[PDB]
Amino acid sequence: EVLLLPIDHQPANVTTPTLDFTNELTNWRARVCELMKNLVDNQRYQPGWTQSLVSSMRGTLGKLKLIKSMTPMYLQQLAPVELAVIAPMLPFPPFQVP
Amino acid sequence: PPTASSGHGYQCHVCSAVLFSPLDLDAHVASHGLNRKTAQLLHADTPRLVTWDAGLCTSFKIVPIVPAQVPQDVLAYTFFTSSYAIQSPFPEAAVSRIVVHTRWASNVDFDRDSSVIMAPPTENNIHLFKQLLNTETLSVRGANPLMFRANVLHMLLEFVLDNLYLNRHTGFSQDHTPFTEGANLRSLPGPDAEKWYSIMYPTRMGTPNVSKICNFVASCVRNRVGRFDRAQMMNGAMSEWVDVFETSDALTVSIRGRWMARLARMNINPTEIEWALTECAQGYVTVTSPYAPSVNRLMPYRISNAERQISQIIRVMNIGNNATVIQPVLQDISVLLQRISPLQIDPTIISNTMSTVSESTTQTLSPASSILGKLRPSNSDFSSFRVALAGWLYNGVVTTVIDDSSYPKDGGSVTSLENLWDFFILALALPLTTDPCAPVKAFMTLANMMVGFETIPMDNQIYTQSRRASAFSTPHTWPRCFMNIQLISPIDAPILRQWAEIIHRYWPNPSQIRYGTPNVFGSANLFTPPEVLLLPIDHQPANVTTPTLDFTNELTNWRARVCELMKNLVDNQRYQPGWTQSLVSSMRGTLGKLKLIKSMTPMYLQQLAPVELAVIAPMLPFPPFQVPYVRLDRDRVPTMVGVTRQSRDTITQPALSLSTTNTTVGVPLALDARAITVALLSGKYPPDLVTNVWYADAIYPMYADTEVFSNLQRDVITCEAVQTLVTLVAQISETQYPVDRYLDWIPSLRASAATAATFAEWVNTSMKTAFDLSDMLLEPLLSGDPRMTQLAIQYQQYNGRTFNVIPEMPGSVIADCVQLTAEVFNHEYNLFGIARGDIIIGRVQSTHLWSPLAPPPDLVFDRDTPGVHIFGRDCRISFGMNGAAPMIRDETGMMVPFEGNWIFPLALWQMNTRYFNQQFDAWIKTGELRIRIEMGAYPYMLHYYDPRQYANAWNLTSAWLEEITPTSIPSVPFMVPISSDHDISSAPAVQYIISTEYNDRSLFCTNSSSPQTIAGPDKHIPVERYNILTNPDAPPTQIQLPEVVDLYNVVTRYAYETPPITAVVMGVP
Amino acid sequence: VALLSGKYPPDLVTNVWYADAIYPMYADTEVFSNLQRDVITCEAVQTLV
Amino acid sequence: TVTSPYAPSVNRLMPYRISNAERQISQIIRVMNIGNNATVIQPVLQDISVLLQRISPLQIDPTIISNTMSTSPASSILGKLRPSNSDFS
Amino acid sequence: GYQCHVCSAVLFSPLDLD
Amino acid sequence: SSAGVLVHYDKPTNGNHYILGTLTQMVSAPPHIINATDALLLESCLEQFAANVR
Amino acid sequence: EHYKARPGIASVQKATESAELPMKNNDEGTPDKRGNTKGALVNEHVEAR
Ligand SMILES: [Zn+2]
Ligand SMILES: [Zn+2]
Known part of the structure; x- marks a missing residue:
């Protein structure tokens, strides 16, 4: 009676903030951006950069972290619904592994 | 820059000789004669604040619906005033209703091209409720x-934006x-005013009849007409303001x-203008102001301190x-400073002082030639210094x-x-840069040259004594040898120790200078106290106005220290034998010749350049934005600055959310x-010079412009717009800000980020159209989610300290007026073509003449009625066999036949429109099935029928029910009888759709030209409106706003005149 | 690129959208045919063995 | 929600009930067909991808990224992301 | 036209003089 | 007043005055780097402690 | 008709029509009626590649 997914799913309601770190995909993006910011901040590991590009790297990483995308919301609030709708209707029923 | 010219020459007129090329020709004749963001940041557009209005201020007009039967047999034609052609303040018609029409009688000079125009309810007004988010509406x-x-x-926002006007005193x-x-x-201008003289003053018409209008005019109060107060200050001049009844x-x-209250708060006067201009000029420019009874000008320019900070933060976000x-x-500020600075280059100073250097011809290095070829003295190499x-x-x-090309x-x-010599150039150039790593980059620049000559210990292997000097651009890369000077051993490596000591001792010290005035301009600078401007170098003002050469200042001391270090290096022990004796003597001579070169640039930088910067700073397209300067204090070196x-x-x-939702700003x-x-080594003044006269001549042309005032007005408009945007977004979606909501009874969808962004875009477009702005407005605040918006800024030190600035949101007259308009609409929904409650689609046949918009209580049922079925989520329908009646599931899982009273959600009816129409319309048309579809709000369209003839309204209801769609619904059709002056017969009239709550608030008067109304709905002139004229005890300056309109009030009309600043404020040239 | 972008229609209603998208799918279904064929497949397997 | 009205009868025959065992055997045969x-x-996979693209309400457009960047790391990441390509198969 | 200084040569294109 | 201002309440040297420290540092003590204002505070505190003892 | 479908009825129908096709019958390697193995003579790993 079930269909496993590699992502978590939540009940569907399109009113939640796009910036929401309860959503694991958004949290993952934010943590990756923070790791890159920590990597670039101290300017070590980058000998040869003739300019202080840290002020631009941190800015663009922050922009990517705070981008407006709603795909993390979609993949956890709606995509399981379409998958569960199509799954019984498929000529080849899903063959799946834990 | 060498531009030779070839071909296409001609003759000269002064001398008839023929030249080679046109450019050579014009030289000979002369001898004979002898993106989007940058544009918005430099030239921001100017909003149009002050706009006048000659016509009477109103937005609710009375429109006739059906004409009166003034030719009739019961009453002779001599009774009505229409026969005598007497103009009346109200139309003579059987039915008259009021509608919304912004500036239907106004007369303006500048028009807000965003108007709310409505047709009478007999027409279709659905097109006003489908403009915003209807793309998939067929x-x-x-x-x-x-x-x-x-x-x-x-619609309400557009209403307010159009109604932002100032009344005008005409005559x-x-x-x-x-x-x-x-x-x-x-009197008001225009092609004619005879109609206006009758419309404006209802209580001026004569009262011959016993009509409703005549009775109202007779009941009114006689002594409230036109002007009753005025403010006359000077004979033979316009009165300042008047108070009139109209x-x-x-x-x-x-x-x-x-x-007007907001603009009056903004108002300033020439005395404050003069004081501010003098304070900004620091006495170099003197402006005058009149001292006499003025005419009360209007110059709305002073703004509070919060909007300046908000606009600065928005500009930083854009950058x-x-x-x-x-x-x-930077280039614009450079070319502006060029016009003021008296520091002129004669680049031949270096050549003249280097020509007389003793050296032998037999030598092969020629340090003078080397330094000249390294410097390459040009003329255009000073925009860099600017x-x-x-x-x-x-x-x-x-x-x-x-x-890096310099290294x-x-x-x-x-x-x-x-x-x-390259080290020389770099060492002199570095102190003038704002980079907080120049002190360490200079030391690394020297250290990298002598690798293997002397070595010092240097932290990690990756950042070493041979690592490029330009890679030390961050505080974390400062070597411990440069931090603790004792690590450099003074035995094997004395030169590096001496250079580190020189850097630690003789590096310039930061200072500051007061700039601008906060009295009217305000202080837009942040992270620093108001009215201050920081500097990298120390500023010691001169007490004399005839400057002369002196060598007691930081830059000359720095050059002397560098020259002394180089003399020590040349006179070393491990370096002396490598050069010939004559070459060493020539090097020492050149160093001594260049140590004492007489250039005025260091004294200029010390004593005059800060004054010029402080003069330029106040009026500027982009106000200064600085962070504290640190000389060698690594702990307080700023590492990041960001906004949220x-x-x-x-x-x-915001104090909690600022840490992890900021974007770093910097380039x-x-x-x-x-x-x-070259700029440091070459600099001179004109032969004679007095700073007072020079600056009083150079600064005066700069202080005749109103660009800074336009910038302040733009900042106010920006703050008003952002507050309005956040308020309107909070109206439809939940947010962090506290705000009240009146329009909850209007159904709305679940707003998403895209819907919020679309609403924000529409609000921004409406505001830009209203205020006549073409550059970006609140655009930077749309890249994210507008449901949760805040403004804040912070900067962080190296140790970990964080200093943040969170400006407070000031008031917003636009948002207050929008909320007021919504609150009034809560009671005046009928005037805007919207009804409350819901409808009932049960068949009703009778001969009575009650209006369906005001149904009797007998024909209305609700959820609390006994014996009524309520239908919710499950609507399974089962057919019938062998004569059994079809049955439909209730909300409690009970099957019931097609009979009785039902409640259907409009969403359910939309989702099952086709299935329900075939099953239900048969019983509804002929049967006892009644349905109460609950909506909450809906537009309506009226239909008037003669009550003496059969009038079946089934066709309109059938069309409506068939046109109900899962996506869209049309306007609700009502069939309303016409009021009758005299006795009439009675005819049947089948009725299907009736309302639930009273919705006849738009009815003004019925049979206005008749003594009485006998048949049909009726109501006299509304006394509840004309309170000033009907209530003898009510004070003239009384309003009862949140419930009614009153259609008649005392209004203040001003005659202030707005001149340009330079017109009233004159400066001595 | 697909993860860093993506936006819903401003007037999106989940009920309407899904009730409109499901109907053509379920109107062209073949699960009954697949069920009718699976029994024949098992029948053939058992007969073969 | 669906509904299938009908009249009472017993002559109707319509076989659509099989066992999970038969379903699993058919699934195993399908897997071995690969x-x-x-x-x-x-x-x-291709036509299920097309179906998901045609049903899903999500609309993908790199204009959000272009506007956010508003243009060096920014130009480098824009050139690496290639907003001008519109294939998300 | 643009002319070199050390040797008198006129180069038409403004960039090849460098 | 970023570095901080020091006031000497009890009979200053020449009259009511405020002392504003600067970015100059003291490196006489090896393990620590002490700026001007902290050096003034340290010297004044030690002088007062010596006076209290004597 | 006064309503047009948001998801659509042509695009969804075409997508479902394309998805409704069965799975290809991989007959290589199996016997033919006379016993010969239907197929081609390529090596197994190379032919899979
Ligand atoms: Zn000539
Ligand atoms: Zn040449």
């Missing part, structure tokens, strides 16, 4: 009932007729009054990590560094004279060390 |  007669709230909010007269004895009537509207009167946005600003000076004001965003390739060696525009997910406090600009060194 | 090749599985 028919042109329907709108989606889920964006009614958004459409209404946009008066006196009434020679016996009507309104001694009254002073007002047909108006309380809502628009309040809106315009609050707008991201893109250099091309701000580089033109930009270096200009970067001081914008240290906070721009970090001026030295391009030698591989670092060279001390054995190389040209590399030594949204909260994370839940926390509603490096690359200068050329050669130009800066 | 035999380690992409020619029999590519059309299935």
Whole structure:
């Protein structure tokens, strides 16, 4: 009676903030951006950069972290619904592994 | 720059000789004669604040619906005033209703091209509720009932934006007729005013009849007509303001009054203008102001301190990590400073002082030639020095560094004279940059040259004594040898120790200078106290106005220290034998010749350049934005500065959400060390010079313009717009800010981020159209989610300290007026073509003449009625066999036949429109099935029928039910009888659709030209409106706003005149 | 690129969208045919063995 | 929600009830049909991808990224992300 | 036209003079 | 007043005055780097302690 | 008709029509009626590649 997914799913309601770190995909993006910011901040590991590009790297990483995308919301609030709708209707029923 | 010219020459007129080329020809004749963001940042558009209005201020007009039967047999034609052609303040018609029409009688000079125009309810007004979010709506007669709230909010915003006007004083007269004895009537321009003289003054018409209008006029009060108060100050001059009684509207009167209050708060006077200009000029420019009874000008320019900070933060947000946005600003400030600075270059100073250097011809290095070829003295190599000076004001965003091209390739060696001169140029150029790593970059620049000559210990293997000197651009890369000077051993490596001591001792010290005035301009600078401007170098003002050469200052001391270090290096022990004796003598001679070179640039930088910067700073397209300067204190070196525009997910406090939702702001600009060194080594004043006269001559042309005042007005408009945007977004979606909501009864969808962004875009477009703005407005606050918006800024030190600035949101007359308009609409929904409650579609046949918009209580049922079935989520329908009646599931799982009273949600009926229409319309048309579809709000369209003939309304209801769609619904059709003056017969009239709550608030009067109404709905002139005229005890300046309009009020009309600043404030040339 | 972008229609209603998208799918279904064929497949397997 | 009205009767015959065992046997046969090749599985994934694209309400456009960048690391990441390509198969 | 200084040579294109 | 201002309440040297420290540092003590204002505070505190003892 | 489908009825129908096709019958390696193995003579790993 079930269909496993590699992502978590939540009940569907399109009113939640796009910036929401309860959503694991958004949290993952934010943590990756923070790791890159920590990597670039101290300017070590980058000998040869003739300019202080840290002020631009941190800015663009922050922009990517705070981008407006709603795909993390979609993949956890709606995509399981379409998958569960199509799954019984498929000529080849899903063959799946834990 | 060498431009030879070839071909196409001709003759000269002064001398008839023939020249080779046209450019040579014009030279000979002369001898004979002898993006979007940058534009918005430099030239921001100017909003149009002050606009006048000659016509009477109102927005609710009375329109006739059906004509009166003035030709009739019961009453002779001599009874009516229409036969005598007497103009009346109200139309003579059987039915008259009031509608919304902004400025239907106004007369303006500048028009807000955003108006709310409505047709009478007999026509279709659905097109006003489908403009916002209806792209997938097929028919042109329907709108989606889920964006009614958004459409209404946009309509109210447009209403307010159009009604932002200031009343104007036009002119008066006196009434020679016996009507309104001694009254002073007002006149307005236009092709005609005879109609206006009757419309404006309802209580001026004669009262011959016993009609409803005549009775109302007789009941009115006689002594409230026209002007009753005035403010006359000078004989033979316009009165400042007058108070008159005329047909108006309380809502628009309040809106315009609050707008006038805001502008009056903004108002300033020439005395403060003069004081501010003198303070900004620091006494170099003197302006005058009149001292006499003025005419009460209006100059709305002073703004509070919060909007300046908010606008500065928004500008910093616009200036991201893109250099091309701000580089033109630096170039503009440079070319502006060029017009003022008296420091002129004669670049021949270096050549003249280097010509007389003793050296032998037999030698093969020629240090004088080497230094001249390294410097390459040009004429255009001074815009770099201008930009270096200009970067001081914008240290906070721009970090001026030295391009790597200036540094030698591989670092060279001390054995190389040209590399030594490159070190000289870099050492002199570095102190003038705002980069907080120049002190360490200079030390690394010297250290990299002598690798293997002396070595020092240097932290990790990756950052080493041979690592490029330009890679030390961060505080974390400062070597411990440079930090703790004792690590450099003074035995094997004395030169590096001496250089580190020189850097630690003789590096310039930061200082500051007061700039601008906060009295009227305000202080837009942040992270620093108001009215201050920081500097990298120390500023000691001169007490004399005839400057002369002196060598007691930081830059000359720095040059002397560098020259002394080089003399010590040349006179070393391990370096002396490598050079010939004559070459060493020539090097010492050149160093001594260049140590005492007489250039005025260091004294200029010490004593005059800060004054010029402080003069330029106050009026400027982009106000200064700085962070504290640190000399060698590594702990307080700033590492990041950022701004925020949204909260994370839940926390509603900016002090908590600022840490992890900020975007770093900063960009490096690359200068050329050669130009800066040439500028430092070459500089002179005109032969004679007095600073007072020079600056009083050079600064005066700069102080005749109103660009800064336009910038302040733009900042106010920006703050008003952002507050309005956040308020309107909060109206439809939950947010962090506390705000009340009146329009919850209007159904609305679940707003998403895209819907919020679309609403924000529409609000921004409406505001830009209203205020006549073409550049970007609140655009930077749309890249994210507008449901949660906040403004804050912070900067962080190296140790970990964080200093943040969170400006407070000031008031917003636009948002207050929008909320007021919504509150009034809550009671005046009928006037805007919207009804409350819901409808009932049960068949009703009778001969009575009650209006369906005011149904009797017998024909209305609700959820609390006994014996009524309520239908919710499950609507399974089962057919019938062998004569069994079809049955439909109830909400409690009970099957019931097609009979009785039902409640259907409009969403359910839309989702099952086709299935329900075939099953239910058969019983509804002929049967006992009644349905109460609950909506909450809906537009309506009226239909008037003669009550003496059969009138079946089934066709309209059938069309409506068939046109109900899952996406859109059309306007609700009502069939309303016509009021009758005299006795009439009775005819049957089948009725299907009736309302639930009373919805006849738009009815003004029925049979206005008749003594009485006998048949049909009726109501006299509304006494509840004309309170000033009907209530003898009510004070004239009384309004009862949140419930009614009153259609007649005392309105203040001003005669202030707004001149340009330079017109009233004159400056001595 | 697909993860860093993506936006819903401003007037999106989940009920309407899904009730409109499901109907053509379920109107062209073949699960009954697949069920009718699976029994024949098992029948053939058992007969073969 | 669906509904299938009908009249009472017993002559109606319509076999659509099988066992999970038979379903599993058919699934095993389908799995063994693959035999380690992409020619029999590519059309299935491709047309399910097309169906998901045509049903899903999500609309993908790199204009959000372009506007956020508003243009060096920014230009480098824009050129690496390639907003001008519109294939999300 | 643009002319070199050390040797008198006129180069038409403004950039190849460098 | 970023570095901080020091006031000497009890009979200053020449009259009511405020002392504003600067970015100059003291390196006489090896393990620590002490700026001007902290050096003034340290010297004044030690002088007062010596006076209290004597 | 006064309503047009948001998801659509042509695009969804075409997508479902394309998805409804069965799975290809991989007959290589199996016997023919006379016993010969239907197929081609390529090596197994190379032919899979
Ligand atoms: Zn000539
Ligand atoms: Zn040449």
